[PDB]
Amino acid sequence: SALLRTGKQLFETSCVSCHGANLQGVPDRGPSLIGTGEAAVYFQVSTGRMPAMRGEAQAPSKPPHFDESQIDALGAYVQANGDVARGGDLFRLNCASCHNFTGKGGALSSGKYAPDLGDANPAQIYTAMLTGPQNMPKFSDRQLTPDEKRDIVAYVRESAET
Amino acid sequence: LLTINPIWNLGPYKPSQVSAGSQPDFYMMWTDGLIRLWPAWEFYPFGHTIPQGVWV
Amino acid sequence: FACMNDIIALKFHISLNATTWIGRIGMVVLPAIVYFVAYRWAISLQRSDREVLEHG
């Protein structure tokens, strides 16, 4: 499992500055994780003011934004709690206004493509869909079942890789 | 009933770490609010310097 | 209420840049209009005590 001692020390070193379970005053803070889990709290928010902890194409180094073991440990610490083609079409209908055209509703320049998503993978997309995003409503439980979330994530991933 | 100061959420004071809500209690809040409101007014009257903290 | 402006920024959805400019402009303007809305309040409370004496 993820080491919660590492998770606490990582929270203190890198996130305490804007988050004491509260949110950063400057701009808009990320805020307390809703339905905290590795799938969504793990998935980064490079878009917007928040900095990108995980760096794409990064070899092991002393200076790094985040550590795979460090990420999991912090996502866990914050989370205390105390037909692929058919899926893609459904995602376009629900998110057809913004996802459709692979573009971004908030910014025309911003896109759902891998360059825009950096080090993207199916798990990172699934996770942001589940609880959605800072400016996007969460989809799990509330709107879409797990098969539907899995299928829409796969469709977005295949469309962006190709 | 009401929790007041959880010192176990944020850990020990290490100078590398950071806390996004660094605020005093309400009797000392007007001192922290006074530092935020004065604008960045420094002097440099000589080779020495006079910081913003003289105005507090 | 300017020392906790980062909590006013997150929860009340205002800004983090504009909560000092409503403080630094407000530090001169707001204590100038609380003088006028309390000097003309305390005198109008006196006139309410003379209507209960003249008329009843």
Binding site: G20, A21, N22 | L2, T3, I4, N5, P6, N9, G21, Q23, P24, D25, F26, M29 | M4, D6, I7, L10, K11
Partner: peptide
């Protein structure tokens, strides 16, 4: 926030209200 600010807010509306509201019952008005 969970530090001194919602705790300081909860002082004046719970604690000092139920410490002035008691004194207005023990004391008089004159």
């Amino acid at each position: 926030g969970f530090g001194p600010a919602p705790e300081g807010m909860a002082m004046w509306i719970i604690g000092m209200v139920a410490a002035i509201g008691v004194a207005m019952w023990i004391g008089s008005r004159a």
